[PDB]
Structure formats: structure tokens, C-alpha cells
Amino acid sequence: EDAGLVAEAEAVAAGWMLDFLCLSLCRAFRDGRSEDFRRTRNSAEAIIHGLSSLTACQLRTIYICQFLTRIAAGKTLDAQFENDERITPLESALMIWGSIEKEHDKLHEEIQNLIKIQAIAVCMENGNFKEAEEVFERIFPFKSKLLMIISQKDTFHSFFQHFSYNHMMEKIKSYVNYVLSEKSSTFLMKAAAKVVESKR
Amino acid sequence: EDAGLVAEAEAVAAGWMLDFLCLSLCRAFRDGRSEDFRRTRNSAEAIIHGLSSLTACQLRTIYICQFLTRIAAGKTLDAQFENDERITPLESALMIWGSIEKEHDKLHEEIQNLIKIQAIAVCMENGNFKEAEEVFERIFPFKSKLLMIISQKDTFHSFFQHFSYNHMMEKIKSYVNYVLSEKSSTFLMKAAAKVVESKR
Ligand SMILES: C[C@@H](CO)N(C)c1ncc(Cl)cn1
Ligand SMILES: C[C@@H](CO)N(C)c1ncc(Cl)cn1
Numbered sequence: 001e002d003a004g005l006v007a008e009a010e011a012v013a014a015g016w017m018l019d020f021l022c023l024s025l026c027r028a029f030r031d032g033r034s035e036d037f038r039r040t041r042n043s044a045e046a047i048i049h050g051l052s053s054l055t056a057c058q059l060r061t062i063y064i065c066q067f068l069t070r071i072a073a074g075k076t077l078d079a080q081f082e083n084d085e086r087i088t089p090l091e092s093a094l095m096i097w098g099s100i101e102k103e104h105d106k107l108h109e110e111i112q113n114l115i116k117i118q119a120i121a122v123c124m125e126n127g128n129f130k131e132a133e134e135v136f137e138r139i140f141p142f143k144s145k146l147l148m149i150i151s152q153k154d155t156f157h158s159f160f161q162h163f164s165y166n167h168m169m170e171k172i173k174s175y176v177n178y179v180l181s182e183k184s185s186t187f188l189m190k191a192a193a194k195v196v197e198s199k200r
Numbered sequence: 201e202d203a204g205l206v207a208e209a210e211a212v213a214a215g216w217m218l219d220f221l222c223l224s225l226c227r228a229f230r231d232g233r234s235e236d237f238r239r240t241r242n243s244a245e246a247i248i249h250g251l252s253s254l255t256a257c258q259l260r261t262i263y264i265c266q267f268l269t270r271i272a273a274g275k276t277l278d279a280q281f282e283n284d285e286r287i288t289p290l291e292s293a294l295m296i297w298g299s300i301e302k303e304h305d306k307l308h309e310e311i312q313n314l315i316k317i318q319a320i321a322v323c324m325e326n327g328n329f330k331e332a333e334e335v336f337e338r339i340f341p342f343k344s345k346l347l348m349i350i351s352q353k354d355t356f357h358s359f360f361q362h363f364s365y366n367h368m369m370e371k372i373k374s375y376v377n378y379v380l381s382e383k384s385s386t387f388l389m390k391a392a393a394k395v396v397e398s399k400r
Contacts, residue, residue: 006227009392016388020213027206043246050239188216190385192209199389 004034015058017047020188022061026180029068030173041069051163064179067096071115072173074165075122088135090119107175112169121165124155131177209252212362217247217256220388222261226380229268230373260301264379266370271372274365275322288335290319294399307375314368319344321365324355 021044028037032074054062070093073081078089085092094115102108116139123132132150140146149157183189221244228237244265254262266333270293273281278289285292294315302308318338323332332350341345349357 003231005393005396008396009389010224012395013388013392016392024210031203039246043243045252046239046243046246050243094320174372187391188213191391192213192216193205194204195212196205196208 005186014047016188018044018051018058018188019183019186021047022065023180023183023186023189025065025068026176026183029072030176030180034072037072041065041072056101060140063096063100067093067100067171068172068176070096074118076126077126083130087138088119088123088131090115090122091135091138094139099126107171111171111175112166114163114171116140117146117160117163118168120150121155121160121163124150124153125165129153208253213292216251216386218244218251218258218261218386219386220392221247222265223380223383223386223389225265225268226376226383229272230376230380231380234272238270241272242267248295256301263296265302267300268372268376270296271284274318275325287338288319288323290315290322291335293337294339298391307371311368311371311375313364313372315347316340318348318358318368320350321355321360321363322384324350324353325365329353 019027021040025040030036035037041075048062048065051058072091073089074093076089076188081092087095094112096113097108097112097161119139120132120135123129123135129150133147136147136150146159148154220267221240225237225240225244228234228240244336248262248265251258270289273289274293276289281292283291287295294312297312297315319339320332320335325331329350333347336347336350346359348354349359
């Protein structure tokens with residue numbers, strides 16, 4: 001048994017598992033299957049730990065998984081995460097979004113701006129206006145209007161009608177559909193569907 | 201998109217991932233690659249969470265993974281595990297070993313008895329003789345001789361030369377070799393090795 005060749009085969013298989021789990025995570029996020037999403041995230045994250053060297057395509061895949069994980073935790077309070085990074089989950093999604101190797105097109109800008117405003121609005125929704133102001137300071141005439149909105153607890157100001165949580169989720173889901181189509185043909189899902197259509 | 205067929209394809213792929221990760225765990229245990237073992241265990245355990253219904257073969261696979269995990273933790277102190285089960289890792293390996301659907305042959309009996317004596321001896325090795333006596337009481341003329349050994353702190357008594365930790369590890373590794381050969385041809389490892397030999 002050649003240990004080098006066994007390690008190489010384990011790396012090929014981890015690459016296949018990563019693409020399959022990204023695909024599974026994308027569909028669970030699109031479908032709103034929260035429990036399936038957290039189980040798939042736990043699996044993808046553990047599989048990622050077994051990899052030491054990543055290609056450009058694999059890095060893009062792990063950062064898409066990290067970004068969707070932060071978006072899904074957008075309205076959830078995680079004590080240890082807040083003490084370690086000193087920022088909120090949507091602010092962490094914003095850092096990943098602005099650093100992924102991808103085209104900065106119209107959809108990219110729309111998603112970026114929707115996350116920026118929702119990082120403040122989710123704090124107002126939870127009743128933490130002091131935190132809403134701290135988020136605003138870390139991210140940012142337009143600024144003076146946004147600061148007056150937070151200060152007046154004007155959570156339902158018309159500005160948030162265009163820059164809503166539902167609009168942020170819809171734009172991100174449209175991006176997820178492109179990722180889903182690009183990976184729909186990856187080895188593991190393709191072979192698994194072949195077994196299903198033959199059964200039957 | 202048929203959601204039922206997608207869920208079915210995800211179940212087929214999880215079955216493939218489980219067999220591959222069991223194979224990887226078996227080799228890491230045989231090779232003494234501790235860090236690779238804990239990374240593979242984390243991956244196998246997360247993948248197992250994504251499964252709700254298991255065949256007889258899949259149950260045998262998850263219990264082999266659980267047993268090797270307890271054997272690997274044999275000399276390690278885990279506070280939360282001790283408070284939850286009120287037993288040591290080798291005693292938990294013994295419960296799994298005696299309940300797996302497998303032939304109770306000569307090798308099975310040898311491994312069983314080696315774990316029983318090592319569950320006491322690892323406590324003596326760590327200097328906890330009160331715990332060695334509590335382990336003895338939960339598991340058990342031969343008994344009176346074993347009780348006198350613990351009581352006299354006779355850790356290097358000739359009885360432990362035949363029933364040693366190294367002999368327990370060797371017998372378990374011989375069993376691991378049978379599991380390794382039975383799964384050497386499973387879909388994921390087989391396809392991954394094909395890619396490696398073609399590259400080279
Ligand atoms: C950077 C890490 C830390 O838990 N992270 C948020 C993460 N999230 C999802 C996946 Cl699949 C992998 N990693
Ligand atoms: C029963 C569980 C609890 O952590 N257990 C010891 C476990 N160990 C290994 C694997 Cl791969 C799955 N499960």
C-alpha cells in the first residue's frame with residue numbers, strides 16, 4: 001500500500017464531497033430548510049478541515065459556504081462569535097462578500113448595499129438601538145439621514161421598504177441559483193442522480 | 201425539480217461518504233495518525249447526522265466508527281463524557297463491541313477480554329486506583345486475584361503482560377484489517393483511486 005497515493009485519493013474524494021455539500025447547502029438555503037442547512041453546514045465545515053491546500057475554485061466554494069452561513073445567522077445572537085470578532089454576522093457576511101474572487105457586477109453591488117442596510121435594521125428589529133449605532137459607525141448626507149433614522153427608532157421608515165430583509169434574501173437567492181447551476185453537474189451529485197433515476 | 205428525488209440522491213451520496221470516511225478512519229487508526237483520525241471522526245460523525253434511516257450494513261458501519269473512537273480515547277480524560285455516561289471510554293467501547301451485529305468468534309472473545317482488563321489497567325497507569333476499583337465493580341477466584349492486584353497497586357503484575365495495552369491494540373488492528381478489506385472496493389474510494397492511477 002502506497003501511503004502517498006492513498007492520501008492523494010482521499011484529497012480527490014474530499015474535493016468531490018465539498019462540491020456536493022456546497023450544492024446541498026445552496027438548495028437548503030433556497031428552500032428555507034433551516035435544520036437541513038445547519039446539518040449540511042456542520043458536514044461541509046468538517047470536510048473542509050480535512051483539506052490543507054485549495055485550488056482557486058475550491059477557495060471560491062468554501063467562501064460561498066461561509067457567506068451563506070453568516071447570512072443564515074443574520075438575526076441570531078451568538079455570544080462567543082460576538083466576543084471573538086467584535087462584529088455581527090451580517091457584517092462578517094459583508095467582509096466575505098467583498099473579498100471573494102468574483103465579478104463586481106450589478107447583482108454584486110445590490111447584494112452588498114442590501115447587507116449594509118440590513119446589518120443596521122436587524123439590530124433595530126431586535127430592540128438594540130445602541131448596537132444599531134455601533135454597526136452604522138463600523139460600516140459608514142445619506143449617512144446623516146440614516147443616523148437620524150436609527151436615533152429616532154424609525155424602524156419602518158420608507159428607506160427600509162426598498163432596502164428590506166426580504167429584498168436582501170431574494171437577491172441573494174438569485175445569486176445562489178447561479179452557483180446551483182454551475183455545480184449541478186459535479187461528479188458526486190451526477191452519479192447519485194443516475195442511481196436514483198435507474199431505481200424508478 | 202422534484203424535491204423527493206433530490207433528497208433521495210442526497211441519501212445515496214451520504215451512504216457513499218459514510219463508507220469512504222469509515223475506510224479513512226480505519227487506516228488512520230491502523231497507522232497511528234492521531235490528528236487525521238480526529239479530523240475523519242469529526243467528518244464521519246457530521247455525515248451520520250444527515251442520515252435518518254439506516255440499513256443493517258450502515259448500522260454496522262456507524263458502530264465500528266463509534267467503537268474505534270472510544271478505543272482511541274482509552275487513555276484520555278473527558279470530563280463531560282464521564283459526567284454523562286458515568287463510565288470510562290474503554291467501558292463504552294465494551295458496550296458497543298458486545299452489541300454490534302457480528303460473529304462472536306475467537307478474535308471477538310480475545311478483543312472483549314483485553315478491553316475488560318485494560319479498562320482497569322489504564323486507570324492504574326494514570327494513578328487513579330479508586331477509579332480502577334470502580335471500573336472493576338462495574339465490569340466484574342479470578343476476580344479475587346484481580347481485586348488484590350488493584351488493591352496492592354501491582355500495575356506490573358505478570359497478568360498484565362499477557363493482557364497488555366499493546367496486545368489489545370494489535371488484536372483490534374487485526375480486526376480493522378478485515379473491515380478495511382471488506383470496504384476497499386466501495387464506490388467513492390474506488391473512483392478516487394481510478395483518478396489517481398490515471399494521473400501518473
Ligand atoms: C469560518 C468558519 C468558522 O466557523 N465558518 C463560518 C464556516 N461556515 C461554514 C462552513 Cl461550511 C465553513 N466554515
Ligand atoms: C455516539 C457518538 C457520540 O459522540 N460517537 C462516540 C461517535 N463517534 C464516532 C462517530 Cl464517527 C460517530 N459517533
